[PDB]
Nucleic acid binder design. Structure first.
Ligand SMILES: [Mg+2]
Ligand SMILES: [Mg+2]
Ligand SMILES: [Mg+2]
Length: 803
RNA sequence: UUCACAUUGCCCAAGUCU
RNA sequence: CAAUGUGAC
């Protein structure tokens, strides 16, 4: 349960496409570099302070140490040199004074860059991480002090333009940077990005932006409690400067004119000690430093210090502004990356140059293949076949594979009658039934119940009424006035309390209908009621389908930024037929920000039991698409989850030992692919076509991984989903697994489109997000309560309630 | 809460010294 | 999924 399998072979399927990748070839010398351990007393210091004290150390001790110029530093305890120092293994004790630190330098090892060549060149079977790490510290050294680091990125205020967001916020532009091995050479992966920062401005102006003042002196009265509290919400925890830098822990209730402390008042303290007649004595003070102490600063002598990222959620308007400032077509993104690289000129970086590293200033050429889509089999009399083109098809003149006959259905309208009238409801009903009939999901007559209601309180009694009164009720259609707490209450009651199918619809989509919205609505309804919308052309499926096989999708979704106690949510779904089309779901709450799926063995067990009850087959193979695990987590996640899958098999039966293929799906990474030739660009966004596959050149040097961009790019630059096989009892070839993966992206029931990840992984998200909806404002005994809230009713268990 | 795509929010990463 | 865009007939 540990070593990922070797790349079995290379894919051959599909016509070829010329692509460029945002990977830049690196020439690394075949030489040793030297590793040194450091430690800085005191070590509570931020990473950036350490880099300063080490920089001053290098220039200061230039002569009795560090004669061999230009070491690089990782911000804590690791230092590299291109040539060795006059150190020996002997520690060395040094003192440095920062404008008072002791630092010791112990040698630790060499890092043979020659061995890295070999690990890339099939000589060595494993890629030496420590060597990659060292190169990464080299490449990051200068920009970590020149710009503001944020994760694997770097940001800066852009020269000559501003992008204010308002509320004291503005857009900074930046780039991602990382060092990757590949089938070819080392790769410098660069991508542009953008994120919100606070403006380095006088706190006074910060006040005026936050409170929506055109200016100060507007007015000269002290702030309302309402104004003061809002300001306090914005600036608490931010850094300010007066030489001196402080973190704001509070805003005082009193103005500086009257705010006092044991020496005296604030206006007068600055008048006497600093000859400062405050221009705005009526305004409060910032509390800074130890919250137990009484260090107060008048607003007027304070600026927001530069380079503080905005952590808090952006407002709706800010968000709008942000989108508008950063939205880029694929060709425009490609050009921005290219521009940025020539601009960056990594080869003039003196530290890169110290280690004799060259970086190519143009994107790597790679060849892709565009896989053929599957054909999609519909039902009805005709049993129509739909042929995807550029990642899209449609249902016009096609009826579902297995369509549900709707005999008994109700409507609850929570939108106000004066806005969503009985006339709207009748027309909507008439249009829906038309579409549903063309779709082969005949809504056989009028609803058995149609009533207005208001408020979350009215939901449960209405639904209890409905469940008790109308035998054979298949659906409640729920009209909502827009965003409302009622939606989450409908799903609480429908999904977990009473076990009743619901389909919510926004009022605007009832008032004004279109065929496409209504048709998409039917796709969800048919599914919710147990129907099969369509299936993969059977004879066009890869060979793996000749034997019972179950397809699992798995995801964990973590709490938002800044959260502290909300659970993370694990979801696992499993196919329940051979098409494969129908899925069932499992879901758990688990520990805050834990990626590993804790209860996975019990989840898979459930899915396997339900698969047998639906199909009367025991799977011979299990295919496990595991979403969202980053590289730095492959081995941890696979050790626990692979064994749990086995555990589930083993505790069911017998030496029931079906082969497992464990695949990590990453939609979010920093690889971007672009059409080399302008005439391959698809649509306004100019993206690579659906089906573009890459498993050469930029992928892993020994393991089994590939990019597949399964979807049509509508806007921006498409994320090519990445697939990495951590385990494979089934010995897929590249072709069969890539084609399987692609084909699974055409089985997603909520649209007649090839989506960006396979359907099982997509459903797992939907399951996790629904649990999250079940926990709204409810997030050992804690654990039990939350577990209970995400638990669907018995009659919901076997359904695609998440669709 | 018709739907997909895309930006952010998510494990690793990053962050924390009068 | 939520905020915001681009689209689907
Ligand atoms: Mg996830
Ligand atoms: Mg961490
Ligand atoms: Mg949206």
């Amino acid at each position: 349960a540990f070593k990922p399998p070797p790349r079995p072979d290379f894919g051959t399927s599909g016509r070829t496409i010329k692509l460029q990748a945002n990977f830049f070839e690196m020439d690394i010398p075949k030489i040793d570099i030297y590793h040194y351990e450091l430690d800085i007393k005191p070590e509570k210091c931020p990473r950036r302070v350490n880099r300063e004290i080490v920089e001053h150390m290098v220039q200061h001790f230039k002569t009795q140490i560090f004669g061999d110029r230009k070491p690089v530093f990782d911000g804590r305890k690791n230092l590299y040199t291109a040539m060795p120092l006059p150190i020996g293994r002997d520690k060395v004790e040094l003192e440095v004074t920062l404008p008072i630190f002791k630092v010791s330098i112990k040698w630790v090892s060499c890092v043979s860059l020659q061995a890295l060549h070999d690990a890339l060149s099939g000589r060595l079977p494993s890629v030496p991480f420590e060597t990659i790490q060292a190169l990464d510290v080299v490449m990051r050294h200068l920009p970590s002090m020149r710009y503001t680091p944020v994760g694997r990125s770097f940001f800066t205020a852009s020269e000559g333009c501003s992008n204010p967001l308002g509320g004291g916020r503005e857009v900074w532009f930046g780039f991602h940077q990382s060092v990757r091995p590949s089938l070819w050479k080392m790769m410098l992966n660069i991508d542009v990005s953008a994120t919100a920062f606070y403006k380095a401005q006088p706190v006074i102006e910060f006040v005026c932006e936050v409170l929506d003042f055109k200016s100060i002196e507007e007015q000269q009265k002290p702030l309302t409690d309402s104004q003061r509290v809002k300001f306090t919400k914005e600036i608490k925890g931010l850094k300010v400067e007066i030489k001196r830098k402080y973190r704001v822990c509070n805003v005082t209730r009193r103005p500086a004119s009257h705010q006092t402390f044991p020496l005296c008042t604030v206006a007068q303290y600055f008048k006497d000690r600093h000859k400062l007649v405050l221009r705005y004595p009526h305004l409060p003070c910032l509390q800074v430093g130890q919250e137990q102490k009484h260090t107060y600063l008048p607003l007027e002598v304070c600026n927001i210090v530069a380079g503080q990222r905005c952590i808090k959620k952006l407002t709706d308007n800010q968000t709008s502004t942000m989108i508008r400032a950063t939205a880029r077509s694929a060709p425009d993104r490609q050009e921005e990356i290219s521009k940025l690289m020539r601009s960056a000129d990594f080869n003039t970086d003196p530290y890169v140059r110290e280690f004799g590293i060259m970086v190519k200033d143009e994107m790597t050429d790679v060849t892709g293949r565009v896989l053929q889509p599957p054909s999609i089999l519909y039902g009805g009399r005709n049993k129509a076949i739909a042929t995807p083109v550029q990642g899209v098809w449609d249902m016009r003149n096609k009826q579902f594979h297995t369509g549900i006959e709707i005999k008994v259905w109700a409507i609850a309208c929570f939108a106000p009658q004066r806005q969503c009238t009985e006339v709207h409801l009748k027309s909507f009903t008439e249009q829906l039934r038309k579409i549903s009939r063309d779709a082969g999901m005949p809504i056989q007559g009028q609803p058995c119940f149609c009533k207005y209601a208001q408020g979350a309180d009215s939901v449960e009694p209405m639904f209890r009424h409905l469940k008790n009164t109308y035998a054979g009720l298949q659906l409640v259609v729920v009209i909502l006035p827009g965003k409302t707490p009622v939606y989450a209450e409908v799903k609480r009651v429908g999904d977990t309390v009473l076990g009743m199918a619901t389909q919510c619809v926004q009022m605007k989509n009832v008032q004004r209908t279109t065929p496409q919205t209504l048709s998409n609505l039917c796709l969800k309804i048919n599914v919710k009621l147990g129907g099969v919308n369509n299936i993969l052309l059977p004879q066009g499926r890869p060979p793996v389908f000749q034997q019972p096989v179950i397809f699992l999708g798995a995801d964990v979704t973590h709490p938002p930024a800044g959260d502290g106690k909300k659970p993370s949510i694990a979801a696992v779904v499993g196919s329940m037929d051979a098409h494969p089309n129908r899925y069932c779901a499992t879901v758990r709450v688990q520990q805050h920000r834990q990626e590993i799926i804790q209860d996975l063995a019990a989840m898979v067990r459930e899915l396997l039991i339900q698969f047998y009850k639906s199909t009367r087959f025991k799977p011979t193979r299990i295919i496990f698409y595991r979403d969202g695990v980053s590289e730095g987590q492959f081995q941890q996640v696979l050790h626990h989850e692979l064994l749990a899958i086995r555990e589930a098999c083993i505790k069911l039966e017998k030496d029931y030992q079906p082969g497992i293929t464990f695949i990590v799906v990453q939609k979010r990474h920093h690889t971007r692919l672009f059409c080399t030739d302008k005439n391959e660009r698809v649509g306004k966004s100019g993206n690579i076509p659906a089906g573009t596959t890459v498993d050469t050149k930029i992928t892993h040097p020994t393991e089994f991984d590939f990019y597949l961009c399964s979807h049509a790019g509508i806007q921006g630059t498409s994320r090519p989903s990445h697939y990495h096989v951590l385990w494979d009892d089934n010995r897929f070839s590249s072709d069969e697994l890539q084609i399987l993966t692609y084909q699974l992206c055409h089985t997603y029931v909520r649209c007649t489109r090839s989506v960006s990840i396979p359907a099982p992984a997509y459903y797992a998200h939907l399951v996790a997000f629904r649990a999250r909806y079940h926990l709204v404002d409810k997030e050992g005994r804690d654990h039990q309560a939350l577990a209970k809230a995400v638990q669907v009713h018995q009659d919901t268990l076997r359904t695609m309630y998440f669709a």
